[PDB]
Amino acid sequence: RFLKVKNWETDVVLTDTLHLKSTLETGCTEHICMGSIMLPVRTKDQLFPLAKEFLDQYYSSIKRFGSKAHMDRLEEVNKEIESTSTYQLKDTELIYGAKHAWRNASRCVGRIQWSKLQVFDARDCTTAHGMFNYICNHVKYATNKGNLRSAITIFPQRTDGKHDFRVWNSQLIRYAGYKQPDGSTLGDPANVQFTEICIQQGWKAPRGRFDVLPLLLQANGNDPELFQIPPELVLEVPIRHPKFDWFKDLGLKWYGLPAVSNMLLEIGGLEFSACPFSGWYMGTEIGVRDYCDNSRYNILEEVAKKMDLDMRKTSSLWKDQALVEINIAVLYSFQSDKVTIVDHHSATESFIKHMENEYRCRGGCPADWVWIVPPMSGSITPVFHQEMLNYRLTPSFEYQPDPWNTHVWKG
Amino acid sequence: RFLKVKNWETDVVLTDTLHLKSTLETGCTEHICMGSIMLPTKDQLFPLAKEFLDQYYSSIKRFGSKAHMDRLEEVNKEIESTSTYQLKDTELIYGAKHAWRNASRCVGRIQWSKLQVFDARDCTTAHGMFNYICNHVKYATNKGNLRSAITIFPQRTDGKHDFRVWNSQLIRYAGYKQPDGSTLGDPANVQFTEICIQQGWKAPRGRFDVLPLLLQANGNDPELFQIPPELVLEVPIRHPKFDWFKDLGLKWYGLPAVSNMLLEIGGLEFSACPFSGWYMGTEIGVRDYCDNSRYNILEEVAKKMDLDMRKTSSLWKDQALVEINIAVLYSFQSDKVTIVDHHSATESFIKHMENEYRCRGGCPADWVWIVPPMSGSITPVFHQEMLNYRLTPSFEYQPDPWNTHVW
Ligand code: HEM
Ligand code: HEM
Ligand SMILES: Nc1cccc(CCc2cccc(OCc3ccc4ccc(N)nc4c3)c2)n1
Numbered sequence: 001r002f003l004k005v006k007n008w009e010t011d012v013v014l015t016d017t018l019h020l021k022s023t024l025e026t027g028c029t030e031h032i033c034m035g036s037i038m039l040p041v042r043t044k045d046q047l048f049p050l051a052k053e054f055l056d057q058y059y060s061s062i063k064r065f066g067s068k069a070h071m072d073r074l075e076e077v078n079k080e081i082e083s084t085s086t087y088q089l090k091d092t093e094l095i096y097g098a099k100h101a102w103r104n105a106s107r108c109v110g111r112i113q114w115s116k117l118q119v120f121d122a123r124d125c126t127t128a129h130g131m132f133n134y135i136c137n138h139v140k141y142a143t144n145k146g147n148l149r150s151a152i153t154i155f156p157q158r159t160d161g162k163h164d165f166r167v168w169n170s171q172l173i174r175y176a177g178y179k180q181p182d183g184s185t186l187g188d189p190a191n192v193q194f195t196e197i198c199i200q201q202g203w204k205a206p207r208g209r210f211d212v213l214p215l216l217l218q219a220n221g222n223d224p225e226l227f228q229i230p231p232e233l234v235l236e237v238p239i240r241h242p243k244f245d246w247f248k249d250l251g252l253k254w255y256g257l258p259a260v261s262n263m264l265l266e267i268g269g270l271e272f273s274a275c276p277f278s279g280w281y282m283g284t285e286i287g288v289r290d291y292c293d294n295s296r297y298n299i300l301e302e303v304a305k306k307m308d309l310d311m312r313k314t315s316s317l318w319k320d321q322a323l324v325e326i327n328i329a330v331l332y333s334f335q336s337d338k339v340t341i342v343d344h345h346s347a348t349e350s351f352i353k354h355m356e357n358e359y360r361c362r363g364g365c366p367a368d369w370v371w372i373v374p375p376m377s378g379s380i381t382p383v384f385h386q387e388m389l390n391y392r393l394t395p396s397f398e399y400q401p402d403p404w405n406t407h408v409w410k411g
Numbered sequence: 412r413f414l415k416v417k418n419w420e421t422d423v424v425l426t427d428t429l430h431l432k433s434t435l436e437t438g439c440t441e442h443i444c445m446g447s448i449m450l451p452t453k454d455q456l457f458p459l460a461k462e463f464l465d466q467y468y469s470s471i472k473r474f475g476s477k478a479h480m481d482r483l484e485e486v487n488k489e490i491e492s493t494s495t496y497q498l499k500d501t502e503l504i505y506g507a508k509h510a511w512r513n514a515s516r517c518v519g520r521i522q523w524s525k526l527q528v529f530d531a532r533d534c535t536t537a538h539g540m541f542n543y544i545c546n547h548v549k550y551a552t553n554k555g556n557l558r559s560a561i562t563i564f565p566q567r568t569d570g571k572h573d574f575r576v577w578n579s580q581l582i583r584y585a586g587y588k589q590p591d592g593s594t595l596g597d598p599a600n601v602q603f604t605e606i607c608i609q610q611g612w613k614a615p616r617g618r619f620d621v622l623p624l625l626l627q628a629n630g631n632d633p634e635l636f637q638i639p640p641e642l643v644l645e646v647p648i649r650h651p652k653f654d655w656f657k658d659l660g661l662k663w664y665g666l667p668a669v670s671n672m673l674l675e676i677g678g679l680e681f682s683a684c685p686f687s688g689w690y691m692g693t694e695i696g697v698r699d700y701c702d703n704s705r706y707n708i709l710e711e712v713a714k715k716m717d718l719d720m721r722k723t724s725s726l727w728k729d730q731a732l733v734e735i736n737i738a739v740l741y742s743f744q745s746d747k748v749t750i751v752d753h754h755s756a757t758e759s760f761i762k763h764m765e766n767e768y769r770c771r772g773g774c775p776a777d778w779v780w781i782v783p784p785m786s787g788s789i790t791p792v793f794h795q796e797m798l799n800y801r802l803t804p805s806f807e808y809q810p811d812p813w814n815t816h817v818w
């Protein structure tokens with residue numbers, strides 16, 4: 001079976017055969033599309049098929065499918081699974097797995113970079129302090145004094161699910177958010193719950209609007225521990241606007257390194273529950289979502305007052321005007337400070353190039369339109385008019401329950 | 412199988428049971444989601460009739476009543492004999508309103524019950540169709556106080572006698588390919604503008620030439636008709652700040668009136684059913700004016716704004732796009748022509764979603780289409796999970812007539 005997708009702006013049509021390799025379910029049926037739903041301890045029984053398929057993938061990619069090294073590797077994994085109930089990935093396999101999990105992340109507009117992922121193997125880590133050390137080195141390497149480099153650090157895989165490694169932070173660098181008794185929030189409202197966990201775990205909060213949160217790190221199933229990232233490792237960019245001199249006076253800054261640490265990396269049936277990864281920001285992630293979402297810093301009002309906009313009726317589009325200016329300021333600040341950032345125009349154009357190239361060399365490119373289209377100016381970016389097929393390939397990054405809702409507390 | 416949709420901006424969760432009434436298929440499977448794809452006999456007809464009549468008589472709280480049972484028998488007898496059947500006026504109106512109500516891609520459905528249905532099933536000629544359309548256009552225009560309306564032409568019989576309005580919308584601007592290379596007027600309508608010329612139309616070859624109506628009755632060759640200009644309300648586009656904006660020579664028409672869709676009620680197929688409401692502002696300013704495949708004026712606008720068009724990261728397109736859309740709303744509002752902005756229309760849709768989940772058990776919705784083409788995340792629909800499924804009565808796509816019509 002072949003499936004065509006059309007770009008309605010360019011009439012370019014592409015044929016997807018890769019969706020045939022898709023095993024996991026999407027959430028949709030013939031009768032209901034769940035395309036806009038955010039989200040629609042594994043025994044030897046189902047593990048070796050997962051292992052075999054990954055190794056079939058891996059050896060195909062190195063043009064060694066069916067070789068003796070391929071058969072011997074299957075046999076070695078087979079006996080290791082039936083003996084030890086799990087198995088260990090070679091370093092080659094882990095690196096392939098990590099890059100392909102990103103390559104397969106259908107919601108990621110940044111995937112043109114997928115093959116340039118720096119993989120740090122932290123599977124020898126055993127303690128929270130050791131995790132802190134690995135994470136610090138990740139942040140320093142990824143940050144590279146503003147010339148950001150994609151990287152992932154992979155901590156030991158789940159075994160029996162009672163010994164998980166977890167990074168309890170949603171991102172390695174995030175600002176605290178404090179709920180005040182009067183109902184107002186200080187800092188990042190997205191982070192109130194995690195901030196309160198940190199403070200309860202002993203963190204002394206500065207209680208400012210841009211406090212970098214501590215790392216809360218869980219090794220081998222033990223209770224998490226608090227560590228402060230050294231501030232010299234945390235690259236931040238003060239946000240100013242190239243024409244509005246009062247913008248700097250809004251006191252805004254953001255950190256430079258987007259580093260997701262709450263997802264689960266699945267490779268050949270193995271589950272890597274702590275796998276922080278980082279790339280670089282698309283400008284709208286800060287300018288549109290982090291500052292302008294009603295449930296975040298929500299500076300639209302203040303920026304619109306300072307621009308002296310007609311804020312009485314929404315049909316004045318003061319919101320849209322303030323939104324563009326905030327996003328101009330974010331891009332200008334990062335570029336001025338020589339910190340890697342990409343605007344949503346450049347990123348989507350690259351994604352289209354990437355996606356076309358993937359259809360030719362790989363037979364398709366799973367893409368979640370709902371997530372790929374930027375949250376402002378959607379239809380003047382070329383992905384808006386691109387039809388996309390969404391399906392699930394492994395290796396993959398998956399969501400996993402927040403650790404504070406599942407963790408058994410030692411004391 | 413009783414599904415919840417969360418709004419992530421507000422944490423409000425609604426439970427959808429309405430989807431279990433879904434009959435038609437979405438194009439998705441458990442292995443592949445097609446949410447972003449544009450378009451993924453006597454025995455068949457009576458179950459369709461029964462289903463529609465069953466919901467009709469339920470909606471008037473006469474389900475299981477003598478009148479219900481008698482109408483079911485009556486339509487059963489008419490199908491057995493005539494191999495089709497005719498809708499009571501009441502069923503036609505319910506059917507039409509509910510096809511809008513079920514239009515999962517329509518952000519405007521909060522208005523669904525206030526639809527003016529014009530029964531044109533007595534129509535037999537293109538001239539007759541023209542009369543019905545003019546009356547529709549004039550009624551719906553209402554001197555700028557727009558009113559929703561649908562006009563319903565005779566249902567399909569054997570597919571050889573189809574009524575079709577060949578225009579995609581009753582009112583659309585012509586599109587001409589220049590010898591130099593590019594396109595004058597509306598590029599979306601170039602092929603149709605050609606068919607009009609290729610059928611006899613005398614084009615002014617301007618930038619905003621109202622296209623003629625190409626009307627097909629009972630399956631005959633379509634016929635050209637100029638909509639009287641006094642019925643086509645147009646809005647000159649000016650900006651409430653930039654006086655040079657008027658010099659772009661832009662205007663747009665007030666009445667969006669879709670004419671190429673197929674309306675299906677109780678298995679009956681209404682291949683000609685032009686309907687109209689009023690514009691959301693982005694439909695003109697984002698899509699009509701700024702799509703690269705359309706009027707594509709962003710460059711010229713940003714030029715007149717003296718924006719740095721040298722790097723995309725200046726967001727000069729975004730800045731210009733906003734001003735254009737500010738002007739569209741300002742122009743329509745200044746000329747007292749009905750229009751809604753994407754913030755107001757999306758806020759209305761969430762309220763409407765709330766109502767439908769409350770009084771009906773759900774509301775089919777296609778996030779990819781409900782989210783406006785600009786400023787997506789600062790509208791409430793962006794953070795709204797939605798379930799997409801196909802309920803009937805429905806508006807459906809149908810082949811373009813010139814690919815089908817036997818001449
Ligand atoms: C290098 C530059 C990168 C850019 C510009 C980028 C861009 C984005 C953006 C904008 C999103 C949408 C997330 C949101 O709006 O909340 C996303 C999603 C995602 N990205 Fe990328 N990304 C980059 C690197 C990476 C890397 C290195 C990985 C993993 C190795 C990755 C994996 C993902 C995944 C798994 C998602 C899914 C998000 C989710 O499911 O919540 N990305 N990306
Ligand atoms: C009254 C105010 C209305 C508003 C503000 C509105 C708004 C919209 C918008 C913005 C779209 C997206 C289409 C596009 O971007 O090209 C749409 C789609 C649609 N609308 Fe509404 N509309 C209105 C009235 C109506 C009426 C009166 C009907 C039928 C009786 C209708 C039926 C539909 C259908 C079937 C679609 C699906 C379009 C498709 O599948 O291509 N709408 N609407
Ligand atoms: N340019 C860029 C590059 C890398 C990372 C980013 C941030 C955008 C992003 C990418 C990937 C994942 C991601 O977040 C996953 C997530 C978030 C919140 C959760 C809350 C609860 C839970 N159980 N899982 C969650 C998973 C964000 N941008």
Ligand SMILES: Nc1cccc(CCc2cccc(OCc3ccc4ccc(N)nc4c3)c2)n1
Nearest residue numbers: 667668669671687688689690691808809810811
């Ligand atoms: N506010 C507002 C109110 C009413 C209508 C509109 C215009 C938006 C709209 C609504 C419904 C349908 C529609 O377009 C249908 C269409 C377009 C192109 C086609 C090309 C080929 C084909 N076979 N079918 C097509 C159907 C647009 N706005």
Ligand SMILES: C[C@H](O)[C@H](O)[C@H]1CNc2nc(N)[nH]c(=O)c2N1
Nearest residue numbers: 384385386387447448449779780
């Ligand atoms: C590829 C995608 O299906 C296509 O661009 C859609 C996206 N969403 C849309 N949304 C609306 N409201 N109108 C459209 O024409 C489209 N086009």
Ligand SMILES: C[C@H](O)[C@H](O)[C@H]1CNc2nc(N)[nH]c(=O)c2N1
Nearest residue numbers: 036037038370371793794795796
């Ligand atoms: C309800 C909806 O699925 C949800 O709000 C999604 C929509 N699309 C998105 N797209 C991106 N890039 N990031 C997001 O957080 C979301 N949120």
Ligand SMILES: [Zn+2]
Nearest residue numbers: 028033439444
């Ligand atoms: Zn789907």
